[PDB]
Amino acid sequence: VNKYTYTSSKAMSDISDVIGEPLAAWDSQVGGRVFNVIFDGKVYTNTYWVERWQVPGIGSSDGNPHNAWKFVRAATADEINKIGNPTTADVKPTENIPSPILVEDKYTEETYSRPDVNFKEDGSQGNLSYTATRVCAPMYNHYVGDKTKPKLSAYITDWCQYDARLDGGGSKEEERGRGFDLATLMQNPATYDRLIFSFLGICGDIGNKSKKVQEVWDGWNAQAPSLGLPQIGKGHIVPLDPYGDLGTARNVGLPPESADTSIESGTFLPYYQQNRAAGLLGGLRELQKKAHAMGHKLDLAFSIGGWSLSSYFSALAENPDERRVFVASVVDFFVRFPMFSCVDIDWEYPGGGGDEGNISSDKDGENYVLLIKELRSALDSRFGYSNRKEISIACSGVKAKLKKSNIDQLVANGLDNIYLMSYDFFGTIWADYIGHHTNLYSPKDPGEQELFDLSAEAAIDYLHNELGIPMEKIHLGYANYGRSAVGGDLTTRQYTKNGPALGTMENGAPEFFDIVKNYMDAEHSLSMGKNGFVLMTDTNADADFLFSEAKGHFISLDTPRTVKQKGEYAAKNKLGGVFSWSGDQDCGLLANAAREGLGYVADSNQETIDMGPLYNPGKEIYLKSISEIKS
């Protein structure tokens, strides 16, 4: 564990029991040592770790994000003389850089230069960047066992896979794609307690991608007779891309040895098992091997359904036997991959919502409850309690449809956990006004928090109070991308609808790591807006954002400080658990911050990088709620 010492001295005659400490003016105090520094004639002690932006002045009953940088005013005028008393200040970014942050990408610069991309830091010549994640640094400190705190998790997806810039490419977005090697986290595993690979699917799905469903179903149906195995109908679960999942070596932390990437949907099927599993999924098992070599076993998990593959949820509803066959495929998968700590489902719309392809009825919610219960029953029928699996579903926070989800009965039928989607509240391309797409906290004037100002705390309170559900069964997290909006006016939250907005790859969805590259910085041990792009924060909702006047372009986003705010709240609640959506594109500093928000403590004096200076707030402002502005 980390350890530090200081000392104090007095005349041989005098022994204070208290830690005597040199009386001095405040100036950029920091660390763990006692400080009784003086400012504005008052005398100030931060009875907690000290940070270079923290100020005792405000600190009189403030000065840390939670409590008083307490004070007395014992100082006399001649103390205020012997020490030149401070009365105001502002911490600046230092001149040096205490730690490296990242490395450039040849191919991303080439990308910016591409005559279609034409990307520029200001985005003027190019609204998108498609920046390769390879730019990123490892960025993980190390931490104590800290067993009591709620579990930590992260989401993971196939977009780790490819960037043909590694393969030359140069003409199309996926050639300028994104992806990273899990070797990253492998370098210092146990980074989380649980992980969730992205929602996969089943035969018969309806959405745009269903041609993939067709292809894989074809490969399966071809293999099955040759394998001497029964054919499958709709509802049987799909891996989506076994060649990616297993027929891989790059991006998957394992030597090209045995990576028969030639194998695919029409041929993988024998290998469709953990023992045989090459590539990504096998690597995941190996990471778990390393993890256990340490200890503290990860909850390895994934789910199925989700935003873009939910379409068949209604279709499968009220087809009990096909639902049975589907869950049969579930338990079959379990047998094929008994490594898994659990896997879950990503139904998203008890009442219709999201993509319209997700056809839906009212009864959907009831039927969903029923089948859920039936799933529980089947699961219990398979599993041994010593190795039991316990299931979760997310929730959308849609104040009404979440009610329509009948969580009460789900609990009564042993669905153990819920993960609240806490992000993208701001449907920036279509939303009426700019707002914080991921605000936990209720702003003032809750009068319009129905399709706007959607403080997740409200749903949280519904669940706790209006449904009595223990927090244990519910989990929250954050995502590693903001929103971007054209022409927004900070006074009105009105903004340019439809106008194209920033993303490296996804317009309107600025990508965190690249934000670190372009717009924000910390090299000088601070939260540092850069390249003329405004760093900013609202007092109404503890909101945090970024702006640029030349295109009136706004960005709503989480931050180390803001995820700190989140985790700190969650910790004070003692929630069931914490996680991050889209974990694929944070260096891990936000994870370290998440540890801090969890109160999860580091285990050594050394660091991968600092984190304290990341909690100075941005440009303070008060933003009126949508109701406030309209009223």
Partner: protein, 499 residues
């Protein structure tokens, strides 16, 4: 043990020629006090220098967050001083005391200090002695202060330079003509870690904190303390470099050690009991602070030597008659208090030596049951135990018939129990004979000490001599002490007229 030193302060040791404060304060606007010192030339010319003085404290704390600072506790406290030309610029003077005299310091606590007329007063508890040189020429340490090398010849066969080699364990054993294991055992550095009874809790328990990294009991706190200045940095085995290695140099200690080994060869027993004895005898007269031998020490030496040779008395018993007795043990070894008492466990609770805050007149509280258990461990009738109880309470000056927890009275009691049976004397036989000897009761309960004045009443040693010899003579007489007491008329009865 027990003693709080969190407000202890360093003290000018009554220096006639050195200046600095000698008393402690609760608070003062003083970063450092200052000290002024008489420098001395080799040719005894006189010079002076001045220094800063420093109460100092230090502490540990993990980096964390959302947790309050300074959840204060008593912890590490230390001292140093400094010199600078701003303190005094007279320099360049090989002819005027590059070498110079000693400096010496008391270590004291300042606290309520009076039996009843209480007031915060200071008492020392430790001493520290130093000699300091102006390295004007950067001369040899034995160009300066040159006697030690000659001594290292005549009782180390070797030069000061050679002493450097001594840090090597094999060099040590070789000059010692003795096996290194003996030293290692002297250092207890083996797996034979110290032990202590569960049934005592020492006050000022700055032990067990995540930062109380020191093992407990400490060696510089138990078992071999004398081999160190009752000082934290006890010498020990240290990791091999050029072979296995010894902790550190302290020529001061090294003599003390050489001396001890020499004695030990004549003391025959292992070192730990020897330490216990010599320590207890040092403890028997607080006048000394040098932890050195003395004539009284010698007396005690011959005392045990003769006593045990005659009647197999254990060092523990002997030292216990001299002073408090060990709750500690080496590994596997068993505590003395327990063996005296919790040896038997015929009750729901083994009596903790922290118990005893009671009153012995009536059998009521389970503490009275403890008193019964203690008396049974002492193989005595509780009623005669209560004959003794007021006597010892009076010797303590304790009031109200009350029993008090402290082992000290228990120890005086145990002496009173043991001394008679050492010669087959009844408790009351001991009382009778003690009275016959001292013309007083309770001296055997009286805590031993030493004094300059001739006072046979306090020379328990010759008292013991006379006691045992003259009791043997009484045995030659074949008579009861009571009968003799009546003969001497030191006991008296009426003569009321009757038929």
């Amino acid at each position: 043990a027990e003693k709080d030193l969190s407000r202890h302060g360093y003290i000018v040791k009554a220096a006639d020629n050195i200046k600095g404060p000698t008393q402690l304060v609760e608070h003062s606007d003083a970063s450092y006090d200052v000290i002024e010192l008489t420098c001395t030339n080799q040719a005894k010319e006189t010079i002076t220098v001045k220094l800063r003085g420093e109460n100092i404290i230090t502490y540990q704390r993990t980096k964390a967050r959302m947790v309050p600072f300074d959840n204060s506790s008593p912890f590490s406290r230390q001292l140093k001083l400094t010199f600078v030309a701003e303190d005094n610029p007279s320099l360049g003077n090989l002819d005027k005391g590059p070498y110079f005299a000693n400096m010496d310091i008391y270590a004291a606590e300042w606290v309520r200090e009076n039996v009843s007329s209480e007031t915060m007063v200071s008492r020392p508890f430790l001493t520290m002695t130093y000699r300091i040189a102006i390295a004007k020429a950067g001369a040899s340490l034995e160009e300066l202060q040159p006697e030690a090398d000659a001594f290292f010849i005549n009782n180390f066969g070797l030069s000061a330079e050679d002493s450097s080699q001594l840090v090597k364990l094999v060099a040590f054993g070789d000059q010692t003509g003795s096996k290194a294991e003996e030293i290692e055992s002297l250092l207890s550095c083996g797996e034979n870690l110290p032990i202590v009874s569960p049934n005592v809790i020492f006050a000022n328990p700055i032990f067990g904190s995540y930062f109380n990294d020191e093992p407990f009991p400490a060696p510089y706190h138990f078992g071999g303390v004398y081999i160190n200045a009752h000082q934290r940095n006890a010498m020990t085995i240290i990791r091999a470099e050029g072979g296995r290695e010894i902790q550190s140099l302290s020529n001061f200690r090294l003599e003390r050690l050489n001396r001890f080994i020499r004695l030990q060869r004549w003391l025959d027993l292992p070192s730990h009991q020897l330490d216990l004895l010599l320590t207890s005898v040092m403890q028997a007269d607080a006048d000394n602070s040098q932890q050195e031998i003395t004539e009284p020490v010698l007396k005690s030496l011959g005392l045990f030597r003769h006593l045990n040779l005659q009647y197999k008395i254990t060092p523990e018993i002997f030292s216990s008659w001299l002073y408090q007795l060990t709750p500690f043990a080496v590994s596997g070894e068993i505590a003395f208090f327990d063996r005296i008492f919790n040896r038997e466990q015929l009750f729901d609770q083994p009596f903790i030596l922290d118990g005893g805050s009671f009153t012995y007149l009536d059998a009521k509280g389970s503490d009275a049951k403890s008193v019964k258990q203690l008396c049974a461990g002492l193989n005595i009738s509780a009623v005669t135990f209560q004959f003794i109880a007021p006597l010892v309470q009076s010797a303590l000056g304790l009031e109200a018939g009350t029993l008090v927890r402290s082992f000290e009275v228990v120890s005086s009691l145990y002496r009173l129990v043991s001394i008679p049976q050492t010669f087959g004397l009844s408790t009351e036989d001991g009382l009778i004979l003690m009275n016959i000897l001292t013309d007083e009761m309770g001296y055997l309960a009286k805590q031993p000490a030493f004094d300059d004045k001739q006072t046979q009443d306090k020379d328990f040693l010759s008292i013991i001599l006379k006691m045992e010899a003259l009791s043997a003579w009484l045995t030659k007489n074949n008579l009861t002490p009571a009968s003799l007491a009546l003969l001497l008329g030191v006991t008296r009865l009426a003569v009321v007229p009757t038929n």
